[PDB]
């Protein structure tokens, strides 16, 4: 797949065994689907927000 989509696949994989927080479920879904964008600064932000390993998303 394209590199833009692998990043979205990584996010979906992080939450596969999880429930999404009611307050975050709309933004999370937008990121997974692509209706919101997903830059480098954002990727580090999300990784810190949920405690993902550094660089988990790319």
């Amino acid at each position, epitope marked *: 797949m394209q590199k833009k989509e692998i990043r979205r696949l990584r996010l979906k994989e992080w939450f596969k065994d999880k429930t999404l927080p009611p307050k975050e479920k709309s933004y999370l879904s937008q990121l997974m689907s692509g209706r919101a964008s997903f830059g480098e600064k954002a990727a580090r932000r999300i990784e810190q927000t949920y405690g*993902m390993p550094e660089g*988990y998303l790319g």
Partner: nanobody, 111 residues
Framework: QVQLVESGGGLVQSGGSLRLSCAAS????????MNWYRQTPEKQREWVAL???????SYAASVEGRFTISRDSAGTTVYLQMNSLKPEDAGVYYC?????WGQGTQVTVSS
């Protein structure tokens, strides 16, 4: 680089309550989310709950409404409050953040 310490486990009667704590090096929980997992006699590593650096939370269906995840006032410690415990909540509970994992703490429910 990051160390994590779970505590608060022990023996508890069915229907009782308990509060687990997770300590994390470098005051990291002030600015970073985390997850709790548990390992029960049948099946392994089952996600339990999460709290983000924002303070927002989610729970597994099997504990939602009975477990509550929060930070202490300092923001350095995360609590997994449990109430209305059942024998099927027994297991080893692990805290995790940034890919690092605690040693775990055992919850035994009598009954």
């Amino acid at each position: 680089q990051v160390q994590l310490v779970e505590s608060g486990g022990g023996l508890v009667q069915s229907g009782g309550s308990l509060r687990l704590s997770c300590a994390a090096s470098g005051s990291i929980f002030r600015t970073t989310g985390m997850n709790w997992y548990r390992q029960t006699p049948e099946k392994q590593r089952e996600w339990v709950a999460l709290i983000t650096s924002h303070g927002t939370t989610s729970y597994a269906a099997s504990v939602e409404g009975r477990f509550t995840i929060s930070r202490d006032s300092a923001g350095t410690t995360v609590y997994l409050q449990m109430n209305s415990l059942k024998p099927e909540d027994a297991g080893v509970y692990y805290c995790t953040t940034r890919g690092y994992w605690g040693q775990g703490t055992q919850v035994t429910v009598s009954s």
